[PDB]
C-alpha cells in the first residue's frame, strides 16, 4: 500500500508473501543502493515487503512484540513507527506502542551509510518500545543503537541497553572538521530506563552531538564513577562554541532525572546547555568542564543528589536561575542569580521518592514521582507552599522569566514548553523551575 506494513513478529529473511522488519529495512537499503543490479532486484519488492508509493515508512502494528535475533543495519533514510489510527483514541499515551525486543545478545540497529564524504541521512523512530538484551548483552558499543547518522527518537521507551560504551546509543562522528558524516541523536518525549555501560551509560558520543528534551531518565548506571550517562569524549575545536550554546541545540531540557547510579548525569562541555530539568535523588549530578565559558545551566532543580555538581579547576560554565546548593552556585550574573536551597528543607512530600503525595504536607517542594493516566511520562509535581502575598519566597514557582537579551542573560531564558508539552509562558510571563510548569 502507501507504507511498508510488517506482517509478522518473527525475524525472517525468507522470500515469501510475509514481510518482516528485517526485510522491510533491507528493501529500503537496496532501493537506495548504487549498484543498479541491486536496485533492479527490488524493483518489485523484496522477500514479501513492498509498497506502491515506494516511500521509506515502516509501519508496525499496535501492542505487538517484534523479535530480532540479531542487529539490523540501516543504510538508507527511513522511518519506523506504530500504526496511528485507533480504529476511540482515549487511552494512556505511550501504551499500544509496538515493541522491538532482542532475542539474543546483539544490539538492535546500526545506522551508517558505510561510506566517507556521503552526507548523513535522517532516521525517525516513533512510538516504539526498544528492549535490549540486558544482562545477556554481549554488545561492546551501543547496546541498543550504534549511530552514525542524524537520528530522531520520539514517544518511545528505551530499555535494556547494556554495553561497554553507550548503553542506549553510541553516537559516532566528529563535527569540528569539514566532515558532514557525523551522527546526531535527538530524543524527545521518551523514557530511558534500565540501561548500563562502563562509560556513557545512556549515550556515548565522541563529541557533544545529542539533545534530550521532554524525557524521563531513570534507573540508569555508568559503572565508572568518573564517567557520565550522557558522555562527550572530545570537545569542539573552538568551532564557535558560543554559537552552539545560544541556539540551545546540544544538551538536556525539560527532563526528569532521578534514581540513576554510578557516575555523573552528563559532562557539560562548551556548547552544551541545560534548561528546566529536575535532577534529584541521583548518585552524581553534573560534571562541569567548559573552559571557554560557552555553556549554560538554567531554570533547573539541581539538589537532592549525593554529589549535585563537580567541576574541573578551569571550568567557567554559567549557572543562572537554578535551585542549587552552595557548591553549584557559581554566582554568574548579578542580574540573573540562583536560588539557594535552604538547609533542612524537605524536598519530597512523601515517605518515598515515588508513590502517593502527602497533599496535606505544609512542607515539601515536590510530590513523589507519579505517572498520570493522561500521560506517558511521570514527573515530580511542584507544590505551592507559599501564600499569594509570599509567592516571591517560593523556591520553584514563578522564579524563571523570558529574557531575549542575546548575551549571558538570554542563556537563562525559560523553555517555551515543559515536559508535558504545556506552554510555560503562553498565558503568563514567568516560568517555574524544573521540568514541570505548576498547573495545580
Amino acid at each position: 500500500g502507501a507504507d511498508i506494513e510488517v506482517t509478522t513478529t518473527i525475524d525472517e529473511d525468507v522470500d515469501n508473501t510475509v514481510c518482516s522488519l528485517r526485510e522491510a529495512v533491507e528493501l529500503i537499503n537496496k532501493r537506495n543502493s548504487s549498484d543498479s543490479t541491486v536496485v533492479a532486484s527490488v524493483k518489485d519488492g523484496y522477500h514479501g515487503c513492498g509498497n506502491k508509493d515506494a516511500s521509506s515508512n515502516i509501519i508496525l502494528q499496535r501492542d505487538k512484540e517484534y523479535t530480532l535475533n540479531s542487529r539490523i543495519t540501516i543504510t538508507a533514510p527511513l522511518t519506523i513507527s506504530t500504526a496511528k489510527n485507533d480504529s476511540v483514541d482515549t487511552d494512556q499515551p505511550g501504551s499500544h506502542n509496538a515493541t522491538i525486543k532482542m532475542a539474543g545478545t546483539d544490539q538492535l540497529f546500526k545506522i551508517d551509510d558505510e561510506s566517507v564524504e556521503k552526507a548523513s541521512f535522517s532516521v525517525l523512530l516513533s512510538d516504539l518500545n526498544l528492549q535490549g538484551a540486558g544482562a545477556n548483552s554481549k554488545v561492546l558499543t551501543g547496546g541498543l543503537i550504534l549511530n552514525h547518522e542524524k537520528l530522531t527518537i520520539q514517544n518511545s521507551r528505551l530499555t535494556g541497553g547494556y554495553a561497554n560504551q553507550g548503553g542506549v546509543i553510541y553516537n559516532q562522528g566528529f563535527a569540528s572538521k569539514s566532515d558532514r558524516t557525523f551522527g546526531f541523536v535527538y530524543i524527545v518525549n521518551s523514557l530511558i530506563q534500565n540501561n548500563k555501560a562502563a562509560q556513557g551509560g545512556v549515550i556515548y558520543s565522541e563529541q557533544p552531538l545529542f539533545l534530550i528534551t521532554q524525557s524521563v531518565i531513570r534507573d540508569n548506571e555508568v559503572s565508572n564513577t568518573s564517567g557520565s550517562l550522557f558522555f562527550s569524549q572530545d570537545s569542539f575545536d573552538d568551532e564557535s562554541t558560543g554559537e552552539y550554546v545560544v541556539q540551545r541545540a546540544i544538551g538536556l531540557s525539560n527532563s526528569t532525572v532521578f534514581h540513576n547510579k554510578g557516575g555523573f548525569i552528563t559532562n557539560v562541555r562548551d556548547g552544551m546547555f541545560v534548561n528546566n530539568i529536575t535532577m534529584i535523588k541521583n548518585d552524581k549530578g553534573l560534571f562541569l568542564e567548559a573552559p571557554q565559558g560557552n555553556a549554560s545551566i538554567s531554570n533547573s532543580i539541581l539538589v537532592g543528589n549525593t554529589i549535585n555538581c563537580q567541576a574541573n579547576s578551569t571550568d567557567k560554565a554559567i549557572i543562572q536561575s537554578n535551585l542549587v546548593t552552595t557548591e553549584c552556585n557559581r554566582n554568574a550574573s548579578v542580574k540573573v542569580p540562583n536560588i539557594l536551597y535552604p538547609a533542612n528543607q524537605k524536598l519530597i512530600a512523601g515517605s518515598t521518592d515515588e508513590g502517593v503525595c502527602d497533599v496535606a504536607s505544609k512542607d515539601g517542594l515536590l510530590c513523589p514521582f507519579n505517572t498520570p493516566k493522561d500521560s506517558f511520562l511521570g514527573f515530580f509535581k511542584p507544590r505551592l507552599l507559599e501564600s499569594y502575598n509570599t509567592l516571591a519566597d517560593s523556591l520553584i514557582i514563578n522564579k524563571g522569566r523570558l529574557y531575549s537579551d542575546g548575551t549571558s542573560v538570554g542563556l537563562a531564558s525559560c523553555e517555551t514548553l515543559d515536559q508535558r508539552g504545556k506552554r510555560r509562558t503562553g498565558y503568563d510571563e514567568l516560568c517555574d523551575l524544573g521540568a514541570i510548569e505548576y498547573i495545580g
Binding site: A119, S120, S122, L124, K150, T152, A175, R180, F182, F184, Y186, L209, L211, E243, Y244, Q247, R248, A249
Partner: peptide
C-alpha cells in the same frame, strides 16, 4: 541552523 537541514531535527539544531 547548526548541523544542517533535517526533516525531523528541531530548527535550532538544523
Amino acid at each position: 541552523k547548526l548541523f544542517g537541514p533535517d526533516p525531523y531535527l528541531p530548527e535550532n539544531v538544523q
